[PDB]
Amino acid sequence: AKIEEGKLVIWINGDKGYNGLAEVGKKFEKDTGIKVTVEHPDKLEEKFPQVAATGDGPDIIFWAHDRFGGYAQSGLLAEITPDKAFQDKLYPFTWDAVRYNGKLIAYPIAVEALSLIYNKDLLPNPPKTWEEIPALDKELKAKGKSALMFNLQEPYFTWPLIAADGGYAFKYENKYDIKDVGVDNAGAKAGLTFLVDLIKNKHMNADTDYSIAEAAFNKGETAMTINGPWAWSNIDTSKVNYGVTVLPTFKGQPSKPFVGVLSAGINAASPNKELAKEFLENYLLTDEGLEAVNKDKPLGAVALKSYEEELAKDPRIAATMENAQKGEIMPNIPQMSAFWYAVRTAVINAASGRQTVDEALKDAQTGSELYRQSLEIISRYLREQATGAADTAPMGASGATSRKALETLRRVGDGVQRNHETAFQGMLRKLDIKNEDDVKSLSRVMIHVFSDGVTNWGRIVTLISFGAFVAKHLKTINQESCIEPLAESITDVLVRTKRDWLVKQRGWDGFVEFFH
Ligand SMILES: COc1cc(N2C[C@@H](C)n3c(c(CCCOc4cc(C)c(Cl)c(C)c4)c4ccc(Cl)c(-c5c(C)nn(C)c5C)c43)C2=O)c2c(cc(C(=O)O)n2C)c1OC
């Protein structure tokens, strides 16, 4: 659980040009004598947060920018401080994607969007609408072919259709109303229903994954796929005559892909930060570094202006950027992980018939909102307990649940602190909480005490009640500013460790019901 000094270990996804990246790594070694090892582990985006938390993991991690806010919030990423001469070399909007709480937390590499990829020998004129695909499949079935196959196991691929008629993740208005989540509105239902009808009508198969769709397209069995620039390499190898074009419309509106910026972050625990900065700035993020990677697997529209000027002339890149402009740049906020996990489950379940569309997307909504809803409740309870007066500000979206949960919490939590005063007092003294630093350390003890045994609402109340007990203390010793970080810490333990149980209860609505 310690990163070796004097070399660089890099993680990148197995669908990217890791062989090309290693070539850049060989050029680095040739100059510096430093060995660069490139790995592509399965589920690297899930592994990185676990291993980095213990001071382990790679020196550099590559992923789309959406995951990096969560990493940064957890303290896992070194701040990046390029000089102006280096910053000026990349498009300002790519830097924006890797900015979190005012600070740059990675190097942007390339802009990625999904496009429609089509076999020009089977389909000289690709469909402009989703709606015409059923009839097109019927035509192609008569030839022993099919219209469309794409990965149905990852929600990234289905999201453009879900968002077309009005589905959205976190509402953007001045900022991201994390409280306003749009995964179960009429637009999202209409899009996912269209997909589920395609499967029911035998135009697609719920089990199709990345590998199956890729093989089917690259063997000329299906006339269309939906994929990103990284996929073009393998299609070149297959010698399918393909084009890349704008995704189909749904209900007269453009498909709206979530746009990712492939980004390179530096592990906060790396003893090799200067090596990493040197590698990224002066080897990778150059014309020749990016070309080496791009020649292995296309990056998309790269962040480096000098090299993108060349790539932009490619009609596949123009198509990529057209789709991107119709879509939206992903948030990098910490709750994106939870959003993706919820929507993944919803798509799979609706596709398989395990849930209806309405059942599936309702669960997704609950799952995506759970962090913020929980924090509203816990923060307000903590602060009103500590100060003696309630917060007057409006709840917001799903404000009844919040209000009702806080009402219930007050009633059911009243007993608890009195009833367990002695044990709460004893635990308080052993913890010796004095400052914000102490608060940040509590996470481990807290997890431990809330571990094992059973899960029920009473125990959740006990968790939060001790929270309020600590908050009251923090206020009396003039550390009122520590209550909000205490609330965040309790929320994080709750929603992570109890996610599936919470969603099963219909979230905080279950709580209000249970103590009715
Ligand atoms: C093992 O299975 C259990 C355990 C519990 N309990 C009882 C005791 C151990 N307990 C519990 C909590 C809430 C979870 C942790 O809460 C926090 C802890 C820390 C360190 C922080 Cl900083 C914060 C903000 C919250 C307790 C919280 C405080 C104390 Cl002092 C105790 C406690 C008591 C009472 N006696 N002792 C010796 C201690 C250490 C806390 C906790 O989860 C269970 C259940 C089921 C329930 C229930 O139905 O209510 N409870 C409360 C359980 O499953 C069998």
Ligand SMILES: OC[C@H]1O[C@H](O[C@H]2[C@H](O)[C@@H](O)[C@@H](O)O[C@@H]2CO)[C@H](O)[C@@H](O)[C@@H]1O
């Ligand atoms: O499906 C959810 C998944 O979507 C995105 O991951 C993409 C990634 O951006 C692409 O570069 C490519 O590798 O395909 C992935 C989908 O399989 C998000 O970036 C990711 O965080 C999320 O889990």
